[PDB]
Design a binder for these strands. Sequence first.
RNA 1: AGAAGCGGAUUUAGCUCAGUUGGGAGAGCGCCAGACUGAAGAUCUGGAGGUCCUGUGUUCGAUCCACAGAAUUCGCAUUU
RNA 2: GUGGAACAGUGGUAAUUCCUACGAUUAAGAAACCUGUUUACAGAAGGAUCCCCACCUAUGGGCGGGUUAUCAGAUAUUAUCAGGUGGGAAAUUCGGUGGAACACAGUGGAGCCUUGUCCUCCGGGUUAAUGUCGCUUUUGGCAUUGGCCCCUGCUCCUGAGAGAAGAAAUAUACUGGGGAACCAGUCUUUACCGACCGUUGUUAUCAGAAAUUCACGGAGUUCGGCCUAGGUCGGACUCCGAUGGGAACGGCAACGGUUGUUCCGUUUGACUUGUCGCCCGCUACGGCGUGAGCGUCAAGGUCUGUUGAGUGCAAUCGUAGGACGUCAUUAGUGGCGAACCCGAUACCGAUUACUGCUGCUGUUCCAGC
Lengths: 84, 146
Amino acid sequence: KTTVPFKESDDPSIPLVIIRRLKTRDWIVVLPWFWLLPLWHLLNRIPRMYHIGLRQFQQIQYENKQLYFPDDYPFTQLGYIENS
Amino acid sequence: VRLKSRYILFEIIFPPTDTNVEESVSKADILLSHHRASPADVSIKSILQEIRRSLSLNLGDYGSAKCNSLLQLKYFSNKTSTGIIRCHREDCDLVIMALMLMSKIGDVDGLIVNPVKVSGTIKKIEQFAMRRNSKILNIIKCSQSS
RNA sequence: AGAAGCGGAUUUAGCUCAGUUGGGAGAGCGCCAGACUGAAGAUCUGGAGGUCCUGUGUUCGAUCCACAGAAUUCGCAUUU
RNA sequence: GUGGAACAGUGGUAAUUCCUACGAUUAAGAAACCUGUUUACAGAAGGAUCCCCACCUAUGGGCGGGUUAUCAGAUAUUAUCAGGUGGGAAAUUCGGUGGAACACAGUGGAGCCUUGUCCUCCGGGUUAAUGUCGCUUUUGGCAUUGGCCCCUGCUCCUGAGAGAAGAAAUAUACUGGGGAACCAGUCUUUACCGACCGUUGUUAUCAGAAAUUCACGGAGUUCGGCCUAGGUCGGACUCCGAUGGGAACGGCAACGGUUGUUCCGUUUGACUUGUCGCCCGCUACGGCGUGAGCGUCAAGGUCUGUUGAGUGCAAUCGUAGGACGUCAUUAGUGGCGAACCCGAUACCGAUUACUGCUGCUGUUCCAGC
Ligand SMILES: [Mg+2]
Ligand SMILES: [Mg+2]
């Protein structure tokens, strides 16, 4: 067996929240700051999981007919200022 | 560093010149009647000696000098009558026009040459030839099943 | 005329190759000459023959040490 | 000192000039080549209106049976097509990353010892205590002990990259060269005090006293003994001695005390095949048949599982027209858009080959007075 058992007295039970985000069609999971990396390191050790860049996130928002704030929002103040 | 030489696939097709013999009108039947067989005295050196003589008598000497720099027959088998000629990318026009004017072999006459596939690599030409022969087997199997 | 990318080895007389506390620039073969034979080979003696891959810099002095620029060539379960 | 012309060095940046169209298939991936038009739906799932026959009620209507007409956003089209194809360097391989989770030396195990010392920078300054020696509220000098103070230049995981040397100089620490911005090596970075680590071997022959602080000769100072017109002896320090590149703890090569050293193993895969175990049915000593089920193990069976290029006997095309730039003309057009070079997993730094632009520096020539 390859595991470490749980103890109610001396093991750090964390809160974990996984929610669906509707228009961007993606599942976001929220967690405390120093807890994220023990969750994050075990993710892509599954051999069918890769990481995303911000240009890749812009490509994902472009593919699903969605919108993006630094680029595809020219109407707003900060978007117009930064983009232009 | 490498060399950008193009390969040309050609196939020997025999037109069924039979004026007194009747003919059957179908697709795979005329594929059988054109893709019959190669004759006995057909090899690599015979096709090379014939195509160099056609290059001499048709295109000349200095054109034959430009063509015969990398004029080699890399792969050929008489069971299927398909061959691959290596050439340059500049004189590929000259090699295909020499393949067009092939009239007869010195032993067997009454034949045409079909240049089918040209590419700068031989591995994709082999992949195209397997797919083309697979389509030929599809046509043969469709006419054989019905 | 079978690339691309990776590691190892390596360049010294015409050739094949040594060699180096860092202080002399070499051996075998080849060429020429001497010796020898009636003549020739072999053996033996002597001479001619240098871009130590090139360059920088270190040092008092570079085949050697450091750096830079070239490359030579093997291997990738191969004899194409 | 200025302006022009030419050359040279370094730093930064760019490279198919761009657009348009075309390049055989019912055998539907043949211009050279690749990818894509795959999260299946017409609120047609008991759909809507309508025809005929029979039934019940009447001011509307509903049910049953039969064939079947119309309709599903631009009354249409089921069978077409789109986009891209070399770079600063892809050459060079010097490097490292995708294995490490912020030093948690990425983790574990074994062996050895000096057995992993919460240790100490040396060194400089202040403060307190003690003891000695000279002035006499008291101060000064020396030695010990205890306490404090003494400087991550920037980004980055790594490799590396570039900035400035007013705390002592004119050349901006030292040394050598460059024609100057500067280059190379040893270094330091708000050091409000500086700090070139130790060991081993080498500098061949000669020279010189000596080739590594061996020793020797001379002069000066201080101390001790014999001794007292101050003569001699010993020890310590400083300076000098013809030679050679040379006496300078200077130059070269190798090794480490840093938080103990060393060894061993992976944390790296996806499909295919084979075995084993788990639930269902038959049978009951281990058995057999299916789940397009799961976990472990093995296999030179495969890796276009491939990347707004992805080849692997190594594709990155041909042509026409238009727009722009440069150069030469006899009527107005012609030529050229290159040089170097070219993937093979991707990333970034540095170096090398060439063109053009830009800033600085140096040299030469020519004048305004
Ligand atoms: Mg390459
Ligand atoms: Mg390379």
